[PDB]
Amino acid sequence: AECNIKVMCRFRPLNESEVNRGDKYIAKFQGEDTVVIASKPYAFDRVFQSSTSQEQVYNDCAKKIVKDVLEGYNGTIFAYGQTSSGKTHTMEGKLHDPEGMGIIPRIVQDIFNYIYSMDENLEFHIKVSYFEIYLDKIRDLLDVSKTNLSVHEDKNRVPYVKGCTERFVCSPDEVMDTIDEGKSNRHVAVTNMNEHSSRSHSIFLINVKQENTQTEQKLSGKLYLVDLAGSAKVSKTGAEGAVLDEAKNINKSLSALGNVISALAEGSTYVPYRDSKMTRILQDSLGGNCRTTIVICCSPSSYNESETKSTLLFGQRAKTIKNTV
Amino acid sequence: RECISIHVGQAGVQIGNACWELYCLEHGIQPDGQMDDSFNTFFSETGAGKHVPRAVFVDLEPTVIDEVRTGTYRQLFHPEQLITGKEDAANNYARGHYTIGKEIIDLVLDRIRKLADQCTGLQGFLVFHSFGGGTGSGFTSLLMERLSVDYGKKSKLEFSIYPAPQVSTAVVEPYNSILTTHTTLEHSDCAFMVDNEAIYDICRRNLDIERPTYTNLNRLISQIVSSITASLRFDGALNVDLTEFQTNLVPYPRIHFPLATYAPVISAEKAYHEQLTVAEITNACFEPANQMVKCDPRHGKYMACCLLYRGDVVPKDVNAAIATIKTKRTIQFVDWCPTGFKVGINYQPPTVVPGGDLAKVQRAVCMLSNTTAIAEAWARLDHKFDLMYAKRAFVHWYVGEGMEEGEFSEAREDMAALEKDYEEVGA
Amino acid sequence: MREIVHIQAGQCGNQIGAKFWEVISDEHGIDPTGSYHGDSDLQLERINVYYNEAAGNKYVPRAILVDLEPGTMDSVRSGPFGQIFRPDNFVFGQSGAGNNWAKGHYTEGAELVDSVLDVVRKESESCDCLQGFQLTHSLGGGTGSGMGTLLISKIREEYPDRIMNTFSVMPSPKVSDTVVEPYNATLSVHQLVENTDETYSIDNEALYDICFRTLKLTTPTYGDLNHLVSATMSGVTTCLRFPGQLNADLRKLAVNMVPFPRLHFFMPGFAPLTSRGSQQYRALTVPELTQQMFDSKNMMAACDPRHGRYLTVAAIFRGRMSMKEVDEQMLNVQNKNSSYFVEWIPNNVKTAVCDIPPRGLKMSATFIGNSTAIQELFKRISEQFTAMFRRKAFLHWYTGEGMDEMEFTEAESNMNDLVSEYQQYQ
Numbered sequence A: 001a002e003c004n005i006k007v008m009c010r011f012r013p014l015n016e017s018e019v020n021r022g023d024k025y026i027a028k029f030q031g032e033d034t035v036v037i038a039s040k041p042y043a044f045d046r047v048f049q050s051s052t053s054q055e056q057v058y059n060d061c062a063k064k065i066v067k068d069v070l071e072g073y074n075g076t077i078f079a080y081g082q083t084s085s086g087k088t089h090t091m092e093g094k095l096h097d098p099e100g101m102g103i104i105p106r107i108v109q110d111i112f113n114y115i116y117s118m119d120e121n122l123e124f125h126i127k128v129s130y131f132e133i134y135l136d137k138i139r140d141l142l143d144v145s146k147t148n149l150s151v152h153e154d155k156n157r158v159p160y161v162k163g164c165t166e167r168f169v170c171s172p173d174e175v176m177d178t179i180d181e182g183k184s185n186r187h188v189a190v191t192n193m194n195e196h197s198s199r200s201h202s203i204f205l206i207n208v209k210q211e212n213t214q215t216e217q218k219l220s221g222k223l224y225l226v227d228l229a230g231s232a233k234v235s236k237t238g239a240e241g242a243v244l245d246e247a248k249n250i251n252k253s254l255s256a257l258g259n260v261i262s263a264l265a266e267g268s269t270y271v272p273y274r275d276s277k278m279t280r281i282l283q284d285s286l287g288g289n290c291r292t293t294i295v296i297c298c299s300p301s302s303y304n305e306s307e308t309k310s311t312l313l314f315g316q317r318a319k320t321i322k323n324t325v
Numbered sequence B: 001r002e003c004i005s006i007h008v009g010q011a012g013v014q015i016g017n018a019c020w021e022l023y024c025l026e027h028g029i030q031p032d033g034q035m036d037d038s039f040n041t042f043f044s045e046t047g048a049g050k051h052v053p054r055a056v057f058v059d060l061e062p063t064v065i066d067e068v069r070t071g072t073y074r075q076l077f078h079p080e081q082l083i084t085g086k087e088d089a090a091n092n093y094a095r096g097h098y099t100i101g102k103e104i105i106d107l108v109l110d111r112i113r114k115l116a117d118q119c120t121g122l123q124g125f126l127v128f129h130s131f132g133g134g135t136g137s138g139f140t141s142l143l144m145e146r147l148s149v150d151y152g153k154k155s156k157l158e159f160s161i162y163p164a165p166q167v168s169t170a171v172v173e174p175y176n177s178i179l180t181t182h183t184t185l186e187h188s189d190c191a192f193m194v195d196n197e198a199i200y201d202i203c204r205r206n207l208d209i210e211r212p213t214y215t216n217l218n219r220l221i222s223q224i225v226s227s228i229t230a231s232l233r234f235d236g237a238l239n240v241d242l243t244e245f246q247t248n249l250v251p252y253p254r255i256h257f258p259l260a261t262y263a264p265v266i267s268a269e270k271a272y273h274e275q276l277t278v279a280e281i282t283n284a285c286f287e288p289a290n291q292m293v294k295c296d297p298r299h300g301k302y303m304a305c306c307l308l309y310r311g312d313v314v315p316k317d318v319n320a321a322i323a324t325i326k327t328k329r330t331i332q333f334v335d336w337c338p339t340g341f342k343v344g345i346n347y348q349p350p351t352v353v354p355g356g357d358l359a360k361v362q363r364a365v366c367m368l369s370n371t372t373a374i375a376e377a378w379a380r381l382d383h384k385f386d387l388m389y390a391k392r393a394f395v396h397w398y399v400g401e402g403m404e405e406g407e408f409s410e411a412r413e414d415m416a417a418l419e420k421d422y423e424e425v426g427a
Numbered sequence C: 001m002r003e004i005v006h007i008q009a010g011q012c013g014n015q016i017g018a019k020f021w022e023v024i025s026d027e028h029g030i031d032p033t034g035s036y037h038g039d040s041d042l043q044l045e046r047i048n049v050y051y052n053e054a055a056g057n058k059y060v061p062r063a064i065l066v067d068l069e070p071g072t073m074d075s076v077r078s079g080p081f082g083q084i085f086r087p088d089n090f091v092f093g094q095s096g097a098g099n100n101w102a103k104g105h106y107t108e109g110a111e112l113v114d115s116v117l118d119v120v121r122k123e124s125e126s127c128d129c130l131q132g133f134q135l136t137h138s139l140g141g142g143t144g145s146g147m148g149t150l151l152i153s154k155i156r157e158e159y160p161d162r163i164m165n166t167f168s169v170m171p172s173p174k175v176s177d178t179v180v181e182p183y184n185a186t187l188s189v190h191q192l193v194e195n196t197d198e199t200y201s202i203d204n205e206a207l208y209d210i211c212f213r214t215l216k217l218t219t220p221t222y223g224d225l226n227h228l229v230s231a232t233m234s235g236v237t238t239c240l241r242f243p244g245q246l247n248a249d250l251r252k253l254a255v256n257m258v259p260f261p262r263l264h265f266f267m268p269g270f271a272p273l274t275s276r277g278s279q280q281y282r283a284l285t286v287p288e289l290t291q292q293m294f295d296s297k298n299m300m301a302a303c304d305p306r307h308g309r310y311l312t313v314a315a316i317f318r319g320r321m322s323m324k325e326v327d328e329q330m331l332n333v334q335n336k337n338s339s340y341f342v343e344w345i346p347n348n349v350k351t352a353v354c355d356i357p358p359r360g361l362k363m364s365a366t367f368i369g370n371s372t373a374i375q376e377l378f379k380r381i382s383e384q385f386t387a388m389f390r391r392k393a394f395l396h397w398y399t400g401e402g403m404d405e406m407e408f409t410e411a412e413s414n415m416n417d418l419v420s421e422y423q424q425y426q
């Protein structure tokens, strides 16, 4: 009926661009519950250090979320932080490497393993879609012909996307092939702060329908995996040209998400999800029947200390929010 | 001994148009461009019997540049100096600093560099702008950052217009001011601030102008910014150069926020009835309601004071004036600077525009004073900023330009550090 | 330099647009044929912002007229300034929309959007730098509410960085000249709230109340209302059209007036408005102008502003006046009515001035206000839509063009979201 939205925090190793400049490792861990930055405690559900592996992060974050979304509830996993925080390394990872792979292929592998373990009587139908945001337009990554998509309300006034190629999948090999095709079709840019900089919020939706032949019981579940872009500082990045136009959309989306988070934390009457389509898609996530999980990535360098503090207090505002599950 | 005067924004270009007429009348230069060392500071000599000023007027919108071109001071200024953009800043620091600036700063930097290379006695620069709007904040910060990284050591005199407490022209002014001051704190050697309601009141109560205009406001501002450099322009018994305003008035590298005021201000009929001596003008310049910023000096203390007199004034009477002002206990000076007076005199008297509101006065004084009274104004600005920041008001325009909430938070904590420094140094 | 693209759709839209072109041509001193005969060089200094230079010292307006019947085009061509418009821009179909949003948005809109898109593209390419797209339409009826919305959507897709300005007339419960008008309004507001950057909400009964109260006219026709709205349409665009001591372009007023992307439905106003026989017995000074600007009955919307709170207002003045008087008048206006202004903004007032007033007046002003009082006019249309929709009345025609009831449900949810958004900040 009521469940707190789970918040996780992660710090990554210092990058080559940071260690050569001489950035200090200011991240200090006091157990798992709380983390201290310049004598300022911040409490979360679980704090991950730089040495934590991908499998350890996945088992701590989204192990029981698979059970929760398969039971009948909805699941939304997404990342927040500044640029060069490690969101792509957390969520996407190295698909070919079994060790370096992120959260999204592991989730599909766990779903397929659970389906194999479950008895044959419970029929499953999984269908996937993959899209992103660019120039305030929703681009479907699975098909190049479309340039803009519309979000329509379903029967109970939950918004969801329309027109995307809803690819019905049966085996994990085609799912991984579709994910690789979407990653190849994803637009990336080279910047001083990051080489493979994800300059757009990539949404990966999996609608899992299931039906029991014996009991005649039906259950549907929308699983969202949203890798968001980082708040890019213009002075640190040296952005000029089309990267500025990308940063406009990125900052608009993250500012709308922050406004929604602040409204939910302070208990606003209206809760303006309508500020952006990126906020509208997460209506069921933040104020629906979803067991949302959010991860914040923080750079342990002293150079990005201000945006690290901003991300930490943003996570603090996001922790107190409760959903109507 | 030269200095270049650049202007940004509607306020800057209007002040430039209002002040260069005063400069040309002072130097005897007709508007056509023709009639030895007095005019050499601000005007050059081009070949034979022709002058051109050391100034550039830059603005993103062309609505000021085309009317400046088609006005009456057409033949005085260079046709190419008047820089014009293509797009409106729209009271947006980000739009004025990032999108529209980048396509014209490449021309502006080259133009100022080539016009400074021919010069050899450049003491520094003076920039006219207004942080209360978009262009005068964003483009000013954009130019001053890359000017400080290039030159750095050379002096920069900032001249800004700030909003009143109860009155405000725009609605995004505290966002613009708190954003641009984060950059102005480190690169600006000294910045004189002016409030609109103070300069409305100074011409109401004294000059008896019931219905003034921005031209009337800018005339006395032009008189002030001409009187500070009158010592450099004309010979004096005790001359003060532009480096005095850096060395003497900036006791710490970040506490560089003086207030400004002027005396006497008087109409034509009242001038013949009121006597002019040093004592009354010295008493009036330290008068709190006579200042150009709505701040109470009685709440704080004067950290430093430089008096610059113009006209036939001996040193003895001004020495007696500052002596009796020191013995006066209504004002209060800080214990960290007992010798907080710097007196200077220029023989050249103030001039009067034909048909202007100001009257002929045999002597005058300009008073730039470093004091802690601006701390209350900055705290007020931060307080009104916080109310809109809590609701995230007017944030979508900024974040739709390229910025975020991180530099907003850095601006907030930098203003908090400014207040911390001011309350620490005022102890 | 900051050219403006003008597009006109619907009967009332092309009528008020033609009157706007007429009055600004009279201000600039442009003959009905197209020749310039002005007296001041400032009129010709910024004639390029609207009119394109032509041979023989002729000037043609950068106007696009689009209508789904030939009758409106024939009327505006037969009007006093019909010949000045470009004949190429007269794009039009054959069959009318019949007061149906679906026909205007799907059937004939799809047939005419490809015909108008290249024309607006050519006009955008002709100028040096387009500033924004100014449009006029009506939420009521089918033609404007479908075709103007579709045109706005396509232009938003083509130019996602430029300004989208709309002067939209919307219905009222006391005056409603169409049976499908709440349906058309509910369908059009869903497109307006997402695509357009600026929107001026105009009400017919508000203009009728103006003409009864302050004009005191005996036989007020639509021509007087066109001249009324053209005054504010010229007032908003005066800043880029002429120099001023404190200029405020469309983007400059938008940045002050649009605190959030959705809350951009304004409440335009204009003054002085008085009868010809009572002109001698009124002082045109700026306090008596400013009180008329903020008078509850003087606004061009049926909502009571005293029942709500202003999010933000802007006053663009014209004519020589004292900045101190303007400042102190706005000061006492925002101070003495502090209960009617939101406390979470320190200054809810924007000011701008131009130095060349309209001909026949020494000083004038226009008021653009964003306030929570528009939620009343929104929710009355919302419940009017809901009462007809809850039994699926007036939908068998809409279903013919492939339109579904889920779209109407989405529009109703959008209207609920918008009125709750306006209620949040009250």
Ligand SMILES: Nc1nc2c(ncn2[C@@H]2O[C@H](COP(=O)(O)CP(=O)(O)OP(=O)(O)O)[C@@H](O)[C@H]2O)c(=O)[nH]1
Pocket (backbone or CB within 6 Å): C009, C010, C011, C012, C013, C015, C016, C068, C069, C096, C097, C098, C099, C100, C138, C140, C141, C142, C143, C144, C145, C169, C176, C177, C178, C204, C222, C225, C226
């Ligand atoms: N202030 C004015 N309002 C008008 C004028 N003409 C119409 N209207 C009002 O606008 C309402 C609807 O606008 P329109 O006349 O343009 C209907 P539209 O042409 O868009 O569709 P169709 O004619 O069916 O093709 C209409 O019911 C009037 O209340 C006018 O000339 N001036």
Ligand SMILES: Nc1nc2c(ncn2[C@@H]2O[C@H](COP(=O)(O)OP(=O)(O)OP(=O)(O)O)[C@@H](O)[C@H]2O)c(=O)[nH]1
Pocket (backbone or CB within 6 Å): B008, B009, B010, B011, B014, B015, B061, B088, B089, B090, B091, B092, B130, B132, B133, B134, B135, B136, B137, B161, B169, B170, B196, B214, B215, B217, B218, C245, C246, C247, C248, C249, C252
């Ligand atoms: N004292 C004084 N202040 C002025 C004058 N003109 C403009 N200002 C101030 O300048 C502020 C805005 O500066 P700008 O950013 O340059 O405004 P703008 O030139 O219209 O720029 P945009 O609106 O973006 O096109 C206003 O709030 C005024 O208070 C003036 O003549 N005298």
Ligand SMILES: Nc1ncnc2c1ncn2[C@@H]1O[C@H](COP(=O)(O)OP(=O)(O)OP(=O)(O)O)[C@@H](O)[C@H]1O
Pocket (backbone or CB within 6 Å): A011, A012, A013, A015, A082, A083, A084, A085, A086, A087, A088, A089, A090, A194, A196, A197, A198, A199, A228, A229, A230, A231
């Ligand atoms: N947690 C981490 N552990 C190890 N290496 C990491 C980690 N996070 C980032 N990296 C290194 O950083 C490189 C690029 O980082 P990544 O693309 O994940 O950054 P980001 O903050 O998610 O970017 P953006 O802001 O563009 O979305 C990765 O290839 C990897 O080399």
